[PDB]
Amino acid sequence: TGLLDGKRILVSGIITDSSIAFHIARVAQEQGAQLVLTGFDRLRLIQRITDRLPAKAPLLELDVQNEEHLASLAGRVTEAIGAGNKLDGVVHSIGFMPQTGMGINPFFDAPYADVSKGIHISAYSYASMAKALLPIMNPGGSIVGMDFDPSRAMPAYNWMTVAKSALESVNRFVAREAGKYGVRSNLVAAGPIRTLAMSAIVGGALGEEAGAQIQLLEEGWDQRAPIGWNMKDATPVAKTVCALLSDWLPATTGDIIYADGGAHTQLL
Amino acid sequence: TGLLDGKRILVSGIITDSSIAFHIARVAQEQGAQLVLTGFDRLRLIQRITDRLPAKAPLLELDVQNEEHLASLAGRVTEAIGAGNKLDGVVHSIGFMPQTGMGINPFFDAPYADVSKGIHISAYSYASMAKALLPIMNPGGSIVGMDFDPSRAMPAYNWMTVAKSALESVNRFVAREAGKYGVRSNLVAAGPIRTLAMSAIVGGALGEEAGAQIQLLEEGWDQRAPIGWNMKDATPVAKTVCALLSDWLPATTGDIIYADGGAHTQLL
Amino acid sequence: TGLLDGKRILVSGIITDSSIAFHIARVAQEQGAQLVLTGFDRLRLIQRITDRLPAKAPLLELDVQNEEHLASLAGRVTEAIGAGNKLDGVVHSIGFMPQTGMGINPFFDAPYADVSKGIHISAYSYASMAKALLPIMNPGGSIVGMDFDPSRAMPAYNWMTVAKSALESVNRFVAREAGKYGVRSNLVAAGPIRTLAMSAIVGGALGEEAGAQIQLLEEGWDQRAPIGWNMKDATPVAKTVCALLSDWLPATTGDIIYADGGAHTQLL
Amino acid sequence: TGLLDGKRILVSGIITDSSIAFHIARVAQEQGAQLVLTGFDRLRLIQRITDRLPAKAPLLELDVQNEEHLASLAGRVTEAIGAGNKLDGVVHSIGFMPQTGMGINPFFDAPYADVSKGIHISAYSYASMAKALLPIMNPGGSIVGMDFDPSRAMPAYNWMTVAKSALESVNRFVAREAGKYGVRSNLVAAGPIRTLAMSAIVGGALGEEAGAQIQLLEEGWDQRAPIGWNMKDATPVAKTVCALLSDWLPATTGDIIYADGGAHTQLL
Ligand SMILES: NC(=O)c1ccc[n+]([C@@H]2O[C@H](COP(=O)([O-])OP(=O)(O)OC[C@H]3O[C@@H](n4cnc5c(N)ncnc54)[C@H](O)[C@@H]3O)[C@@H](O)[C@H]2O)c1
Ligand SMILES: NC(=O)c1ccc[n+]([C@@H]2O[C@H](COP(=O)([O-])OP(=O)(O)OC[C@H]3O[C@@H](n4cnc5c(N)ncnc54)[C@H](O)[C@@H]3O)[C@@H](O)[C@H]2O)c1
Ligand SMILES: NC(=O)c1ccc[n+]([C@@H]2O[C@H](COP(=O)([O-])OP(=O)(O)OC[C@H]3O[C@@H](n4cnc5c(N)ncnc54)[C@H](O)[C@@H]3O)[C@@H](O)[C@H]2O)c1
Ligand SMILES: NC(=O)c1ccc[n+]([C@@H]2O[C@H](COP(=O)([O-])OP(=O)(O)OC[C@H]3O[C@@H](n4cnc5c(N)ncnc54)[C@H](O)[C@@H]3O)[C@@H](O)[C@H]2O)c1
Ligand SMILES: O=C(Nc1cccc(Br)c1)[C@H]1CC(=O)N(C2CCCCC2)C1
Numbered sequence A, B, C, D: 001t002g003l004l005d006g007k008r009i010l011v012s013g014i015i016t017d018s019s020i021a022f023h024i025a026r027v028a029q030e031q032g033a034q035l036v037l038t039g040f041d042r043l044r045l046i047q048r049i050t051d052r053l054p055a056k057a058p059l060l061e062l063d064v065q066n067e068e069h070l071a072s073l074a075g076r077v078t079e080a081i082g083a084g085n086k087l088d089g090v091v092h093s094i095g096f097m098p099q100t101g102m103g104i105n106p107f108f109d110a111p112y113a114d115v116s117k118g119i120h121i122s123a124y125s126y127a128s129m130a131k132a133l134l135p136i137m138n139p140g141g142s143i144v145g146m147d148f149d150p151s152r153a154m155p156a157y158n159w160m161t162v163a164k165s166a167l168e169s170v171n172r173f174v175a176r177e178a179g180k181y182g183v184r185s186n187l188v189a190a191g192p193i194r195t196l197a198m199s200a201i202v203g204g205a206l207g208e209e210a211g212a213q214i215q216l217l218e219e220g221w222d223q224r225a226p227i228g229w230n231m232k233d234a235t236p237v238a239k240t241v242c243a244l245l246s247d248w249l250p251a252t253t254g255d256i257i258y259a260d261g262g263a264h265t266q267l268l
């Protein structure tokens, strides 16, 4: 009876209880969705974290840089949700950039191997996951990825900005493919969320100046947002992802929905 | 139990059974909303049309060019929904441009009096309506207006394009005001919908070349849209408006959601 | 031998020696252009100001709200530059909004008559001037208007933002008409320039909060701009307008060039 | 006495006489610039081609994937233009994507190694070249790269679209670095130019459907462009690059100038 009643949804990207994907998973389950989860590398940790979700959900291993994992993924999902069943939704909440590509390390000093790894995980993998899963998605389905608005440059975000610009472009091409299946593809551009790592960066993990810059970004964000922005609360973001996973945005694809308090619409 | 259960929503803009606002009203009522309707000039016609909606809804007169109508509107709404009750939602589905400002009449030949009238009704009135109704809206509420993507020029749409560009700008300022009330303001940029008037234009009501241009626009739209576009079906648009009226896009304001099949994301 | 050698260019919008148009006129003359000037209302003042330009230029009266002035304009220009000669360039540097539509007066309290007047002068008149002058422009010619980036809302600029959004839309339609003549149409989106009026607003002419907001805008602008921004210097803006008036941007029309230090490309 | 009189400009990207960079080089020399050229792999061919330029220019080898080439580049340039002299301009006209990432090969079938190579050459190298050359650029200098508008998806261009989206993002960060040197960074988004390779693709080199799609793109481009578009003529593009290399766009950085006939401003 919830927003997502009866829907089978794959959620990637949980690593801590502060992960945006954890909150996406929690809200989707509150709204009646049946989930399959995917996790990278630390599956014991991730199972222990996801035990706290309101309902049980199978956890599958997925390193998006691993071709074998991607080749087997649809079969492993079908095993978890049962033969003859398909997915209605896929959430990509995956991002990574080596520390040379973010923070106080100069923009020009990031080696391309590092940048390439970040773009692989943060942008190309959105296509990789759609390739793997569209064959087991139902018409009317929905693929959602997470974005951080890269239309303008900003301090420290550096090559991760570039990776997000690439992701936005990938999403428009994934929509062309997904459309053949009756499936939508979209991104949610979220405001800053104080995940574990972000608090670590604010605390200086990538250099003092980067931490200072993020605090400034956060303060400015809430100021600009006409309805404000609470960086400690991922729930408005998770709700937005569930809106796109639902039946209520049926004519939106290849697009970007901004769950950012309206900040990007305001100069000051 | 629907998406809009318990919500009180004002819907403007119904004039025929093919009006986008009629379909918005129908879907909102299907999803549990309690409506108040507003109508321009032809209230007997509009009552007869809206008798076909699934539930009863009070019809109020509102000419957005009439200062008296706007000054009395909140009191008349409060009378209709009962003292102590406020609105959760407001739908602006109002547009007009004199024939000198659209169609085959040359762009340069539209007198400013005509253009000004079109901008008054199509853009300024979004601010007028927000001014009148924000004092009787609840926190968490939502103001939605209808848009037709004006970021690029196109044949025949002419000064109505300009009016929509102005509307998009107005919406960003209305978000700043609405935010003070805990209310969101957004537009839905819809693909072409074959309303009575559009079929009239396709049939040559504003000149043969304009009709030909709209048919080309419509065909191109469905081609570009990765999930296609059915100009005869307003329901995907109405669903999108209901999504914004709901609780499920709580961090989106001053913004534009595209219910256009994804066409604007694709060149060809 | 200058950039604009041999070119005949009409420059509107001079009212003080700090007007952007004064600096446009000065630079164009330095670069070899032969000018015709147009002025509103205070022609004695404007002649006295423009006596300080490096070369003589005929001054013609043009109130863009006056239909007679617009109807006679091409004939008066042809008289000034000589029969058989046409214009190569037209600069629109005209803007106005009543004080109810800018400053600390609330957004919702601007009467539409005031907003309409501002849109007439600031947006519709770009079309009016193109209508009047395209019949006496040479192929390869260039129409340039002044813009202040309205893609996001901001404090106090209010309905002038809306007028600029409308102008951007008008410019795209003027390009369609101008193209028939082999003429380009573009806008220059300038950073903040401390004209007489702006210093007056900073000094509180439209309310204290508006003045404070502009100082904040100015400071933020220079901070964001990767090459900085000097609000006291209009010359980089004037140079950009001359670039568009020249032969060196032959494939750019309906477009917006940002002479803003790069500020709009940067979040922080 | 030309537009670029006295300026020392590095031009990369010549491989045939139809290369956009050849035409950029030709026009810059016509306008008084003194050039240094860089070439990839086929230096005998490139010397023979560039012998046809109006003036002599040293050719240097530069594979942007080669760290040694980049590390030595500034020293080799300084050798060619003489100690104590610096560059005023740098043109990046470099792009590549393996055939798996463009054409009729499905979007999902491009291996990441191929995509990474394309992004390395087409996007990261803009940063690589700026890193190498900013230490030998004069204040007031200008870095220009070539772009093909990737804001919307389109048939066949596929991962090259993604690479261009990344480039646009890189350019905004390169502007932040370049600004420290008093140097601007910008892209020129060109309309389609019928280079050797493009004619090869139109002739079916990357599959019949891709060729058909490009012909459609080309036809639509000229139709939309308000001043038209001649895919056989690179000169308007080269002129635009020279405008950015000149002193006449001094307040534009991190930005994109569209030398596309105005096509991107028009829907139809
Ligand atoms: N935190 C914010 O402020 C913010 C804002 C907007 C968007 N986003 C985006 O939201 C998404 C989730 O980020 P988050 O803030 O929740 O951080 P997070 O660290 O909780 O999530 C990132 C996830 O990426 C996964 N990942 C990394 N490498 C992987 C690989 N090889 N294979 C599979 N998964 C891999 C990690 O295991 C982790 O689960 C990312 O796309 C991020 O860019 C974050
Ligand atoms: N039809 C499409 O293709 C399309 C596409 C995108 C957006 N839109 C927009 O959707 C909205 C509804 O348009 P529609 O196609 O349903 O047409 P419609 O003719 O059914 O609706 C337009 C409404 O505006 C009302 N109106 C006109 N002058 C008014 C005034 N003075 N005061 C109050 N109301 C007034 C009319 O009475 C009518 O109800 C408009 O904003 C239109 O621009 C339409
Ligand atoms: N000053 C800035 O910060 C800034 C920034 C970006 C863009 N702009 C724009 O540049 C242009 C010039 O502005 P400015 O700052 O030089 O101010 P200004 O006051 O010097 O110029 C505005 C001009 O508009 C003219 N004008 C007003 N009503 C008119 C009418 N009825 N007919 C004809 N002309 C009329 C005035 O006489 C004046 O010459 C305007 O379009 C303005 O919006 C200004
Ligand atoms: N042709 C068009 O329609 C078009 C349109 C817009 C933009 N562009 C862009 O203009 C630029 C030039 O393209 P073009 O059409 O003139 O094609 P071109 O083939 O003539 O130029 C591409 C150049 O990239 C060089 N290159 C490839 N790999 C390299 C490497 N490892 N190191 C150094 N250089 C390398 C090639 O040697 C060649 O000189 C590219 O950025 C292209 O994306 C082209
Ligand atoms: O890093 C972030 N913001 C951030 C913003 C500005 C500067 C810097 Br340094 C960082 C947020 C946005 C984002 O994509 N994140 C990712 C970064 C890679 C690992 C997963 C989380 C976290």
Ligand SMILES: O=C(Nc1cccc(Br)c1)[C@H]1CC(=O)N(C2CCCCC2)C1
Pocket: B095, B096, B097, B102, B103, B148, B154, B155, B156, B157, B160, B192, B197, B198, B201, B206, B210, B214, B217
């Ligand atoms: O007119 C429309 N499309 C349209 C598109 C292209 C050219 C021309 Br002429 C028309 C649609 C979009 C739009 O705002 N409409 C309005 C026009 C004013 C009266 C209410 C409906 C109808």
Ligand SMILES: O=C(Nc1cccc(Br)c1)[C@H]1CC(=O)N(C2CCCCC2)C1
Pocket: C095, C096, C097, C102, C103, C148, C154, C155, C156, C157, C160, C192, C197, C198, C201, C206, C210, C214, C217
């Ligand atoms: O007003 C301006 N900036 C400005 C910016 C922010 C808030 C406020 Br209040 C003002 C500048 C930009 C602009 O279009 N101007 C116009 C305003 C109308 C009269 C001519 C000059 C001056």
Ligand SMILES: O=C(Nc1cccc(Br)c1)[C@H]1CC(=O)N(C2CCCCC2)C1
Pocket: D095, D096, D097, D102, D103, D148, D154, D155, D156, D157, D160, D192, D197, D198, D201, D206, D210, D214, D217
């Ligand atoms: O490829 C092009 N257009 C193009 C457009 C649409 C589909 C396809 Br397939 C191709 C043009 C634009 C562009 O970046 N080019 C590059 C491609 C890589 C090698 C150098 C030239 C050529």
